[PDB]
Design a protein around this ligand. Structure first.
Ligand SMILES: N[C@@H](Cc1c[nH]c2ccccc12)C(=O)NO
Ligand SMILES: [Zn+2]
Ligand SMILES: [Zn+2]
Ligand SMILES: [Zn+2]
Lengths: 158, 148, 144
């Protein structure tokens, strides 16, 4: 009954010449997310929520964003390693919820694939993983398509 | 002991000619929230947090925002979950929301068949920053705890 | 087994001529907040988990956090954990995280391993990315 909650946030700029990878899904699009890694904003937010629930710091503490070994890093591999460290700390994952905010492209066709990827990486059934997709109702830099944001919440138990 | 958490986010533009309805409360104001529904940003954020905790997707996949919140609660129950508590924040530079918070909590508690002491609504400004600080929209955030 | 969750949000403008205090820590930097954004978010998350309203209805931001914790306890709740994120484009916050965690854990009378603080930039986007403000987000779990 030693439950703990974590929360996560990430944002990346949307720029030409990059793959668009969200929730482990390579989405065909003229632009992609800019980062040292593959810039998977959704997986990073979930990773942060998991480290946070376990009181293990944050994604930047665990994976160096200047190490050449993480250039173009597969963020699913990072999420699996996060889950491994959370387990080593003594915690079991109970559920993850998340939101992606993007003006474009349409994300609804890809949500089920993202959910399946996250569930596989966390060794969870599909019914403990949720991904919600939103626009920002045309407001701000999100409404202008300059970046994509993700939010996440995770419940774990020791 | 099968607890789950959900989180929700919503934002809508403030435009002339619409009533301002937040948490089911009609607030006197020169503008109101723009949307296909009544654009109740707080009820939508709570609805998304409840769908998220139950792993039932989101408000866009599933659909007056109180009727929608009641239907969301029905679908959460249909999945086998009981709602334990909801917490939330509204971010608006104007108008003042404190006089309306208790009516909002009462509306949410009635719609979710919860006691008042399991529902919470918090009010914030954005310190004059961004589109929220310029009064161009209102944001809501929500967290929900459920149990199977 | 009567668990409850709360969530908190705060933001303040960042301009020259003020000290930068986050999580009770004075951080060397050319600008400061116009205002402890992290402690307020945590305070709001705790009031929210207890269904006691918000920081504006109830009230140094450390003294406020300690009083918030006292009211949460008198309402019958024990705090189980806090997690949080600070979004600031500059300065680097990683060197101060342990000091922030120590201050929060002390104020909440929690073991250190139940308090977490995460740090992010906003990738140069928006008022946060331009260094015009700093945001904090928080989540708290309590039990009656
Ligand atoms: N959002 C941050 C999270 C992060 C920090 N250090 C890392 C190292 C590898 C991958 C991601 C990270 C980022 O750098 N994405 O590319
Ligand atoms: Zn990232
Ligand atoms: Zn809405
Ligand atoms: Zn504040």
């Amino acid at each position: 009954m030693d439950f703990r909650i974590g929360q996560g946030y990430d944002v990346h700029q949307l720029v030409p010449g990059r793959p668009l990878i969200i929730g482990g899904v390579t989405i065909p699009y003229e632009r992609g997310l800019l980062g040292h890694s593959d810039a998977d904003v959704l997986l990073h937010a979930i990773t942060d929520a998991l480290f946070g629930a376990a009181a293990l710091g944050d994604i930047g503490r665990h994976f160096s964003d200047t190490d050449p070994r993480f250039k173009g890093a597969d963020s699913r591999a990072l999420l699996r390693e996060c889950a491994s460290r959370v387990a080593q700390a003594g915690f079991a994952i109970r559920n993850v919820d998340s939101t992606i905010i993007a003006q474009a492209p349409k994300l609804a066709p890809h949500i089920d694939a993202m959910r399946a990827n996250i569930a596989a990486d966390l060794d969870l059934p599909l019914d403990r993983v949720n991904v919600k997709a939103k626009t920002n109702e045309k407001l701000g830099y999100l409404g202008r398509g300059e970046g994509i944001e993700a939010q996440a919440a995770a419940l774990v138990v020791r």
